[PDB]
Design a protein around this ligand. Structure first.
Ligand SMILES: CC(C)(C)c1cnc(CSc2cnc(NC(=O)C3CCNCC3)s2)o1
Length: 265
């Protein structure tokens, strides 16, 4: 720990500081807390690099490359005009690349949210930090303990909708409020759309029965290609929900580019 000069707390199972490495001179993010040593080899341009793992005097320190901004603050700074569609598309495409990589190594994020998506001046966006319920998949809320990579696609679909509309898609303040906000928009799931749903641990026959709404009302002014991709990322059935690899081939990305964002640091 003495090899690092903490400069400021930057938030957060632990606490994260911006710090300087007294040996290399590098400015890093230092998180104070075999599976971790395994994550050190999971390297990709859209995953925040874990530089070092320091296991000294019981506690564990994780040293990551430092990124200057997060998506939540960027969306808050862009709320008057909105993030330009080409930049939304670039960020979505990059996060799907990051997830396709994670998912092929049987690694799940499980808690994607704007606060843990980090951005730089070069147009890159990165997955980090592998309670806010807004981005939680319905199978998690219904008590599935052995959920899949599809939970990350759901969270990314919710984030996609929020970048487009400048409002949270499902802003619940309790597990049942979160579940009922999803049901009110997408319709109360049944055996037709989601086989096996009625046998989920926390499913109740007594849940109210709401009808589905059209996506044209849910994400205006998203074009037909975007709405089609979003609908596939928000399928109730995790086995029907689009994979990160298949989403990368969706027509919505035919004209994808890598714009540079306006970042005031
Ligand atoms: C929960 C959260 C803090 C996101 C976290 C846990 N583990 C990691 C990866 S370390 C990291 C790298 N660069 C980071 N930059 C920042 O937090 C920025 C600092 C200036 N304000 C905007 C955010 S944090 O991040």
């Amino acid at each position: 720990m003495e090899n690092f000069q903490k400069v400021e707390k930057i938030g957060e199972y632990g606490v994260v500081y911006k710090a300087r490495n007294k040996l290399t001179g590098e400015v890093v993010a230092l998180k104070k807390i075999r599976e971790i040593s395994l994550l050190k080899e999971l390297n990709h341009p859209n995953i925040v690099k874990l530089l070092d793992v320091i296991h000294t005097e019981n506690k564990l320190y994780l040293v990551f490359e430092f990124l200057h901004q997060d998506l939540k603050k960027f969306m808050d700074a862009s709320a008057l005009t909105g993030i330009p569609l080409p930049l939304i598309k670039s960020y979505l495409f990059q996060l799907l690349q990051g997830l396709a990589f994670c998912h092929s190594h049987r690694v799940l994020h499980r808690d994607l949210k704007p606060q843990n998506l980090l951005i730089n001046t070069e147009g890159a966006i990165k997955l980090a930090d592998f309670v806010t319920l807004w981005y939680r998949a319905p199978e998690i809320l219904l008590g599935c303990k052995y959920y899949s990579t599809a939970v990350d696609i759901w969270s990314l679909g919710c984030i996609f909708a929020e970048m487009v509309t400048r409002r949270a898609l499902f802003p619940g303040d309790s597990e049942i409020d979160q579940l009922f906000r999803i049901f009110r928009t997408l319709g109360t799931p049944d055996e037709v759309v989601w086989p096996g749903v009625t046998s989920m641990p926390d499913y109740k026959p007594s849940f109210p029965k709401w009808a589905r709404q059209d996506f044209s009302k849910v994400v205006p002014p998203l074009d037909e290609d975007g709405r089609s991709l979003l609908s596939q990322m928000l399928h109730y059935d995790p086995n029907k929900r689009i994979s990160a690899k298949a989403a990368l081939a969706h027509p919505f990305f035919q004209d994808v580019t890598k714009p540079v964002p306006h970042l005031r640091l």
